[PDB]
Design a protein around this nucleic acid. Structure first.
Lengths: 96, 91, 96, 77, 104, 92, 108, 87, 99
DNA sequence: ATCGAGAATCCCGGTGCCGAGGCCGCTCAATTGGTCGTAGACAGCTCTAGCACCGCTTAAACGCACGTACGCGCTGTCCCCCGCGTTTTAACCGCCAAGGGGATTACTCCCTAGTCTCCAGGCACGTGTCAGATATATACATCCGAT
DNA sequence: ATCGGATGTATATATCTGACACGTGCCTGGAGACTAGGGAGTAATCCCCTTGGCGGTTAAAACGCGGGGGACAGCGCGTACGTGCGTTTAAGCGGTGCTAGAGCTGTCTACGACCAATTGAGCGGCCTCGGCACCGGGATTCTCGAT
């Protein structure tokens, strides 16, 4: 099934999985990748972008776009968990 | 004058994707595809009859030719569709 | 002035020509070649216009598939540059 | 005539084939290969045409030639 | 009535029987053979057009075109296995780059 | 019970190309396989040609064509010459 | 009646024009089979058969055997370009392969 | 009444030196030790396809015995036509 | 006096000359036949084989692997290796279109 | 580098055997030799689509420069695989036994070729709407120094 | 590593045209209702070839042990091909117009399916002997560690 069916997903900064793997996961889950800071439903990175509060993640914060770890998509693929749990039990940002 | 499969293809398209249409080139490819698969199954059904000295292609030569030509789940599902159809047709 | 590095535009071209479906050889010189080759097996021929289109679709598809096999042979040799020996290998494995 | 298959036209084909870098000896090699490929398809298609007593080669003549060589081409049939 | 309607098929059972006889595939053709064959052709037709319409819907386009047939047939393992040597006019090829060819 | 094979005609042809030479039963079995394969290729192609042109009859013309398609180059020209020479003799 | 005369003997063939005509009908290849067709086909089968046995007997002579065996058929076929082209996807039982080592594999 | 116990692991019956002998006939001078399991994989895939088709010709005939003709027809339709067992 | 030893690859060449000259079936008959029965029982239980049907299966298999090894050998030589390796088999099969 | 052992190969020749060539019955399938219906060879007509050729546009092919990253020849070194001696295990061969099932014959009846009559399906061909091709401006996605 | 610039890309919005979806008339092929004869489903019998099994020999497999030569990493450098510009040419287009020849039509006759009576040709079996295989011993080739 495709949980991200209509959703836009921003990728920021360093990732352990490469860009094409994260894009392939977004596609397999039905969502759309972007690089634009202010129009996504979810933002994705390692801890680094929120840990630094990088200028691009400050735009994500002022947009109130909730942030998930790179590996939190692995659970979105691997389990039956609800979207809210995947964005609350799994979250990086204090905003959302 | 010039027969084809095009309207039956279109009726199948209306069953699987009601909103969808099909370009003339794509419809020409479906006519090509249906004729190829038909020639494969009929050729192999013929060869099955000759190896067994049978005069007749029955539903069973078709079923075997299909089990030979198709891979895996296409083969299993195709045989089920043939079984369903001949069952339904019989009454 | 600005400049892309070697191989960057080649990758940009791979993405482009894999995304499109148009025939890649100019029509008229391909048609002209077909006439020369045919003229030896019989003089005074004519072609349906669609028949030359079928030949172009065949030749382009065959050459593209051969170039994919050729690409593997160069990669196997740890090259990225294809060379005539790669074509000759691929064709000999195919048994052409 | 075969040199009318231009250098960039062969590059475009190699690009569709995913090829990144191309040693220049490939163009003349590919022209050779293509001429062999066309000779066998045309000779078979022309044989079907001439068998049928036609002078005009049909799309079907090409399709049958390709089909007997197993390079089965849909869309013209 | 019609043999297609007794079979519940959209495919043309009557035509299929006539083509089986006229092709010289055998001396005789039993009444169940064209029913089974029409069912199999209809199923495979639906199995391709299922995927082709999904490929079209993946994209924005609403009518199937040769590109969509090629992408469907090559993405599916079993159709690609069934149609390995077939060329589709105006198909192009799968988007596919070997990883060795990329930067870094 | 009664089988049939090409074996005696294979043997006659052998005596004509090489008078002194004999042939093994396995080699003879291979020739019977080969003769049947080539017969089925030619007859199969001649069927397609007839069908494609709406002709109901396979004739010498369909065979002569099927041979130019199936055989390579010089092997084809000789086979076509042999087929021709045999039919003109048989016409007498 | 006149004395019976085989169609093979009219054609000057060893191959059985009668059996070939039978098989062309019973193999369902067409509705009808024209009277020259089995002669033409028999001549072609005979020519190819003679063409193989020609080369096979030569290979057996070169290998100093009076009897053709499957090995000589394989060697004779792979030694002729048009036969190997005609038979490129055929396996010969008991054939083995051409004697062939790639030149780079030999000692310096 | 009788039966035989199910056969196991007979793919390792294809001995290391048997694979070496095949490669020697194939003109191979030196063999990396990783080739043997890969070769067994390929041979098993080949045999699965040929047997599946041959068994299907046997089933079609309503026979229980697989014949040389069942095998020859399988190989023929797979484009690996074998002479020496037909006729 | 040191024992006589051929240098490496020298006996391998002699084996190639031997096994290309001969027509023997190179796989042990009985283990090949057990493998056939072992595979076959996945499609239909309690099958039987004509003895010649097993011979035909072996002749096919030996020819198939020998041919694949020739293509594998070309792939190794093209990479400037003398040694065949699993990537050669994977390449040869992919260019043949067996995968 | 050219030169002695020595190891495997290729080469005589006596044996002795079983697979191939030949010969004989004889069953049946090929031929001889008569209809007759129709496939298809041939003649005529017609109209369409392939070839020819024309002038203009502008996309594409070409030729040139240049530099960088690739191919690749070179060296080291590390370990794998080959070659060779020993142990062992199972393949192989002969021969034994039972009986599954493959091959064959014979019946009889289901069904499918075949004819005739009927009509609805599906084709050829009109036609109007709207999917998507072509801009056209726009807001990215990602590459390349420069830090 | 970040960051700015740039520039190639994919994205909204707008038109607009020609391709496809639908509607129509009709004509021919499927389908309904027969008929009838032969294809193949089922029984029954036979015997053959398959599967199981046993004991003995010895060929091949598995194994262990060196050690040298091959894979492959690293790397120095010569050059050949990628990216980009200015140049030029020939592909494309949309035009016209011609006419060969693909296509349908109508006739009629050459031949090939058909039947049946007839007989030699090819197959199934029994031989018997000579081409081959098999050692046994022999000379020749080619390799290797000397030099």
């Amino acid at each position: 099934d495709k949980p991200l069916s209509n959703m836009k997903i921003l990728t920021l900064g360093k990732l352990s999985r490469n860009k094409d793997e994260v894009k392939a996961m977004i596609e397999k889950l039905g969502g759309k990748l972007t690089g634009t800071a202010n129009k996504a439903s979810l933002c994705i990175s390692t801890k680094k972008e929120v840990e630094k509060m990088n200028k691009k993640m400050e735009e994500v914060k002022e947009a109130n776009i909730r942030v998930v770890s790179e590996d939190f998509l692995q659970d979105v693929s691997a389990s039956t968990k609800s979207l809210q749990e995947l964005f609350l039990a799994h979250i990086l940002s204090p905003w959302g | 004058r010039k027969e084809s499969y095009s309207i039956y293809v279109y009726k199948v398209l209306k069953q699987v994707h009601p909103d969808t249409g099909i370009s003339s080139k794509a419809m020409g490819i479906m006519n090509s595809f249906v004729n190829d698969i038909f020639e494969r199954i009929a050729g192999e059904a013929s060869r099955l009859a000759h190896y067994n000295k049978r005069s007749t292609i029955t539903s069973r030569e078709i079923q075997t030719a299909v089990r030979l030509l198709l891979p895996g789940e296409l083969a299993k599902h195709a045989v089920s569709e043939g079984t369903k159809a001949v069952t339904k047709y019989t009454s | 002035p600005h400049r892309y590095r070697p191989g960057t535009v080649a990758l940009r071209e791979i993405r482009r020509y894999q995304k499109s479906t148009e025939l890649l050889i100019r029509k008229l010189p391909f048609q002209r070649l077909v006439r020369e080759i045919a003229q030896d097996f019989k003089t005074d021929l004519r072609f349906q216009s669609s028949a030359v289109m079928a030949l172009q679709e065949a030749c382009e598809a065959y050459l593209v598939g051969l170039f994919e096999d050729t690409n593997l042979c160069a990669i196997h040799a740890k090259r990225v540059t294809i060379m005539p020996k790669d074509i000759q290998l691929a064709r000999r494995i195919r048994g052409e | 005539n075969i040199q009318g298959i231009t250098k960039p036209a062969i590059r475009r084909l190699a690009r569709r084939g995913g090829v990144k870098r191309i040693s220049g000896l490939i163009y003349e090699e590919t022209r050779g290969v293509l001429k062999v490929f066309l000779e066998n398809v045309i000779r078979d298609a022309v044989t079907y045409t001439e068998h049928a007593k036609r002078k005009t080669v049909t799309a079907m003549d090409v399709v049958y030639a390709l089909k007997r060589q197993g390079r089965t081409l849909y869309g013209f049939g | 009535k019609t043999r297609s309607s007794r079979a519940g098929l959209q495919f043309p059972v009557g035509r299929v029987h006539r083509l089986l006889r006229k092709g010289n595939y055998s001396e005789r053709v039993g009444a169940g053979a064209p029913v089974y064959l029409a069912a199999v052709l209809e199923y495979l037709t639906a199995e391709i057009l299922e995927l082709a319409g999904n490929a079209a819907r993946d994209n924005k386009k609403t009518r199937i075109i040769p590109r969509h047939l090629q992408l469907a047939i090559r993405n599916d393992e079993e159709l690609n296995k069934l149609l390995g040597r077939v060329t589709i006019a105006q198909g192009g090829v799968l988007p596919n780059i070997q990883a060795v060819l990329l930067p870094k």
